[PDB]
Amino acid sequence: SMSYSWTGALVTPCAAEEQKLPINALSNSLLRHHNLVYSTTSRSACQRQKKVTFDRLQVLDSHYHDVLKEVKAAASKVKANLLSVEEACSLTPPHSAKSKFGYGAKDVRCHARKAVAHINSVWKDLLEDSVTPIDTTIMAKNEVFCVQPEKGGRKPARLIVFPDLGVRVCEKMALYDVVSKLPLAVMGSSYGFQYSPGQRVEFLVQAWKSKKTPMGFSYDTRCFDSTVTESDIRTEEAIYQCCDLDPQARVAIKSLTERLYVGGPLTNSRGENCGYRRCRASGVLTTSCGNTLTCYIKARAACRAAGLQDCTMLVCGDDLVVICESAGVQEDAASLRAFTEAMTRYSAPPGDPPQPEYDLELITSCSSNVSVAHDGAGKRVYYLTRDPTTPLARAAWETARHTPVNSWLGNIIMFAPTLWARMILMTHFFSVLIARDQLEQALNCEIYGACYSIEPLDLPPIIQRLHGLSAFSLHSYSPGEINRVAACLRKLGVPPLRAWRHRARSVRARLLSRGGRAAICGKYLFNWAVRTKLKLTPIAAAGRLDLSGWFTAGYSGGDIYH
Numbered sequence: 001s002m003s004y005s006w007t008g009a010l011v012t013p014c015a016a017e018e019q020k021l022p023i024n025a026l027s028n029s030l031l032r033h034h035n036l037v038y039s040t041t042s043r044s045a046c047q048r049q050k051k052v053t054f055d056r057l058q059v060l061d062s063h064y065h066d067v068l069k070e071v072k073a074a075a076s077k078v079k080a081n082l083l084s085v086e087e088a089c090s091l092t093p094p095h096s097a098k099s100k101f102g103y104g105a106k107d108v109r110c111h112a113r114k115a116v117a118h119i120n121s122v123w124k125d126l127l128e129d130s131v132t133p134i135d136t137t138i139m140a141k142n143e144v145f146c147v148q149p150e151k152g153g154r155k156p157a158r159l160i161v162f163p164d165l166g167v168r169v170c171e172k173m174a175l176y177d178v179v180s181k182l183p184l185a186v187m188g189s190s191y192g193f194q195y196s197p198g199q200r201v202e203f204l205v206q207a208w209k210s211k212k213t214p215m216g217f218s219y220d221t222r223c224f225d226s227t228v229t230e231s232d233i234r235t236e237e238a239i240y241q242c243c244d245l246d247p248q249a250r251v252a253i254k255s256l257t258e259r260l261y262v263g264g265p266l267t268n269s270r271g272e273n274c275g276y277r278r279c280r281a282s283g284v285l286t287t288s289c290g291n292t293l294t295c296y297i298k299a300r301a302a303c304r305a306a307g308l309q310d311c312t313m314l315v316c317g318d319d320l321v322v323i324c325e326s327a328g329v330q331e332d333a334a335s336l337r338a339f340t341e342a343m344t345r346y347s348a349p350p351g352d353p354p355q356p357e358y359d360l361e362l363i364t365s366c367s368s369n370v371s372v373a374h375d376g377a378g379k380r381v382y383y384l385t386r387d388p389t390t391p392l393a394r395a396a397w398e399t400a401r402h403t404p405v406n407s408w409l410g411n412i413i414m415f416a417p418t419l420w421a422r423m424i425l426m427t428h429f430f431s432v433l434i435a436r437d438q439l440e441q442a443l444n445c446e447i448y449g450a451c452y453s454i455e456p457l458d459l460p461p462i463i464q465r466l467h468g469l470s471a472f473s474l475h476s477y478s479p480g481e482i483n484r485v486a487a488c489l490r491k492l493g494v495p496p497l498r499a500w501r502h503r504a505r506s507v508r509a510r511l512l513s514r515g516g517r518a519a520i521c522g523k524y525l526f527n528w529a530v531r532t533k534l535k536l537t538p539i540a541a542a543g544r545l546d547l548s549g550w551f552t553a554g555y556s557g558g559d560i561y562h
């Protein structure tokens with residue numbers, strides 16, 4: 001059972017693709033080593049195709065079946081509703097790919113007659129035909145990275161596979177409520193997307209503290225989407241059907257499963273037949289929920305096979321971290337080998353073998369880790385951080401070029417307490433918004449795969465709400481964290497922190513002079529930058545922010561706008 005079969009046709013671009021970071025005075029002011037920053041393009045798709053194409057051998061055992069029974073039992077408690085066409089239309093992002101049937105995202109969002117007509121016809125066809133494969137488009141993702149020579153140079157483009165806009169709206173109708181509710185019901189505290197960054201830290205720290213001698217590891221499945229089998233996808237359908245659903249939803253979900261999720265033909269942007277998929281599509285509404293469920297089932301069963309004691313797992317799509325009670329160094333190492341062997345039997349071998357870790361800060365989940373800093377009183381404060389290389393590289397690109405959805409604002413929100421987000425990202429972007437007179441302009445950004453419209457001037461109350469008041473006064477960061485930041489700045493040609501402090505003092509002064517929300521930004525975000533610090537009291541407007549639904553479910557690949 002090959003994940004893909006290919007015809008030899010190329011994955012083709014739909015527009016001009018830039019490979020190299022453009023030179024721009026403002027981007028260069030953030031980082032000068034522009035030759036290290038690149039975007040993936042369709043040019044490397046062949047290399048990706050090779051990597052993602054393989055045979056899946058899958059052997060399920062008693063542990064697998066025991067866990068599946070638990071999951072189905074949990075699912076039976078869920079009630080999920082159909083969304084109306086109108087409701088689903090409104091979840092469509094302004095930048096979603098247009099339909100081949102004569103309408104686009106804007107038409108969907110304004111409920112235009114042509115769009116709604118077609119959507120209704122697609123729905124009727126899902127109800128009447130449960131068999132005919134639905135077409136999909138395959139594209140190469142254009143995503144920005146920094147080169148890492150020691151690690152093979154440049155990453156090939158990821159491939160995304162997605163159906164027509166009409167179909168995407170129907171997926172929302174049938175499954176939006178299901179994918180928004182089911183993971184949590186099934187795996188409880190193990191579902192990672194229910195947590196804001198601070199809540200994720202709280203979960204990991206308590207798990208770590210709860211063990212007599214904790215041991216943790218991350219498990220990296222090689223090409224997770226390709227490892228997902230037809231039977232895995234049909235099992236996901238069986239799980240969805242355990243919920244209390246509307247009768248039409250049951251039919252639609254079965255049709256979507258057999259016609260779209262389980263596999264189908266791949267067409268490139270030029271209309272050429274590229275091949276056929278028999279694994280997870282990366283650009284459907286169920287990508288995140290499906291990957292999370294399937295990862296959880298296999299991992300939980302594999303923990304049992306591995307004889308791991310008192311396991312706590314955190315699962316976000318294909319990203320898995322496990323914290324358990326150590327049985328000793330040799331014992332733990334052997335258990336991880338057994339865990340890997342089990343995961344391999346279930347179709348999910350690792351890229352690189354997992355390694356047992358015995359320090360909390362060294363455990364990396366969704367490219368992030370827990371670290372410790374201190375508040376003004378010397379109290380330890382735990383917070384979520386990560387290596388700043390990718391965030392800075394993308395921030396540079398987004399300064400040089402207008403992008404539909406900007407990673408930098410999401411990164412500031414997620415990583416607000418970090419030394420690097422505070423001193424570099426905040427200083428940089430407020431200076432940019434000041435230069436361009438864009439302080440008042442709302443921006444699109446992503447949080448767990450869903451697109452939000454956020455006003456940069458609302459950052460302080462947002463940060464207080466998610467991270468607490470201490471986010472604006474952390475100091476005495478860890479040696480490992482300081483060193484990681486320092487190494488990154490050297491690599492990328494980013495000015496040193498003391499230079500950013502000077503720049504921040506100027507940014508702060510300009511914001512203060514504007515009064516209102518701008519002044520609150522200057523006061524709270526940049527208190528670290530002045531000699532005589534202000535007293536920061538709770539921000540009034542904080543409680544009035546509607547953060548409903550932020551950090552509650554994963555929607556990567558799902559074409560969701562909130």
Ligand SMILES: Nc1nc2c(ncn2[C@@H]2O[C@H](COP(=O)(O)OP(=O)(O)OP(=O)(O)O)[C@@H](O)[C@H]2O)c(=O)[nH]1
Binds near residue numbers: 070074186
């Ligand atoms: N994690 C989790 N497990 C659950 C949940 N609900 C039920 N289970 C477990 O799932 C297992 C299978 O469920 P059932 O087959 O319905 O349990 P049963 O009806 O008593 O039948 P047996 O378990 O086979 O004896 C049970 O052992 C439960 O402990 C849940 O909400 N979350």
Ligand SMILES: Nc1nc2c(ncn2[C@@H]2O[C@H](COP(=O)(O)OP(=O)(O)OP(=O)(O)O)[C@@H](O)[C@H]2O)c(=O)[nH]1
Binds near residue numbers: 223
């Ligand atoms: N499964 C999946 N993950 C994606 C996709 N796009 C971005 N990602 C992210 O990529 C991560 C997986 O990266 P890796 O474990 O490094 O594997 P990889 O994507 O093949 O990249 P390499 O390490 O170069 O092999 C996931 O955890 C996601 O956070 C996607 O379309 N599907």
Ligand SMILES: Nc1nc2c(ncn2[C@@H]2O[C@H](COP(=O)(O)OP(=O)(O)OP(=O)(O)O)[C@@H](O)[C@H]2O)c(=O)[nH]1
Binds near residue numbers: 288448557558
């Ligand atoms: N289509 C699709 N996109 C995904 C999936 N998982 C993650 N993504 C998106 O891929 C983009 C890049 O993923 P990131 O979370 O930044 O991970 P990354 O590109 O490997 O970069 P690092 O985490 O820093 O290593 C983000 O916008 C994610 O929302 C997926 O399963 N399908």
Ligand SMILES: [Mg+2]
Binds near residue numbers: 221222223224351
């Ligand atoms: Mg992986």
Ligand SMILES: [Mg+2]
Binds near residue numbers: 358359360
């Ligand atoms: Mg230790």
Ligand SMILES: [Mg+2]
Binds near residue numbers: 367
């Ligand atoms: Mg990554």
